[PDB]
Amino acid sequence: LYFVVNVIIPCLLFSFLTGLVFYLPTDSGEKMTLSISVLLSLTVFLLVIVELIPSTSSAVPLIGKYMLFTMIFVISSIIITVVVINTHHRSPSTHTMPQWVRKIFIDTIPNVMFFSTMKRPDVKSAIEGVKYIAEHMKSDEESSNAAEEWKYVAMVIDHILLCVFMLICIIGTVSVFAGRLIEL
């Protein structure tokens, strides 16, 4: 009871939060805020754990095992969040969307996400000037469409990753501890 309350519960909370980061839309530019603050909280808690658990070396304790899994869990989260941000801000000038990315993440995947709510004289000069303004607006709209397609792809990746990372947190959590729980 003492060790549960004083050690394990805080670690559960931080695992949950880090998992939550994937529901934050990329349009709110605060993905790096949240993920790096979670990482610093995790580092500090590493500090805590070494402060608390015994310093034996015979064998890896259960808390040791669990701490290692938690560290990898946080790290993965952070790296995929960076990945999404980088995908969203993908320059069309230097990159071209592969056909299979578009087919998979824009067309099919959003459709199988049922529980989600995501979308599935001088008059001639004047006239020429007006025409130029209109055609420039056309070209700007085209550029903006390509950018919006990239943002749409990011959003639908966030949805899918939110599902996926809840699943991974569950699976890993059950596996790490069920053996020892049943042993007691």
């Binding site: 006239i127 000037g129 303004i133």
Partner: protein
Amino acid sequence: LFYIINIIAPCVLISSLVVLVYFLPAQAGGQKCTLSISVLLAQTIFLFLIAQKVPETSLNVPLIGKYLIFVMFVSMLIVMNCVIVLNVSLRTPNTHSLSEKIKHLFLGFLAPEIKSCVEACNFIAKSTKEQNDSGSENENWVLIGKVIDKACFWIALLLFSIGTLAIFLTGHF
């Protein structure tokens, strides 16, 4: 085994995070500096952590302390390079000058009412043209920044891997 499980592996995991900064965008909102300076703060925490394990004699620096200094310094270099990329990508023809050298290296190898209406339409089109020129220059500088991202990514990956493997396989032998 005790040192590997309690000091070496946790330290290595945290320190390997500095190689992530090369996949953040190099423009405002990318937060290269936020990330990198936070990683440096964790590295400081590691230096404090190690002060508690090494022996108290002061005639030499232990090997592990040497290694910590080395990795901290490499992380600092990569934070510097993120900052330099941000500086390069936000450049403008007015503050700086995009030498053609850089361009080759990166963009290469790598009634009176009628007359007043027509005058106002012409002026509107001209203002739009001016604004678009300025912008065009700006996007050129953003594309240079993206090239530099790729190139620096590869440099940093190679450097970190090599450095770490060698230094920590010397101790194992």
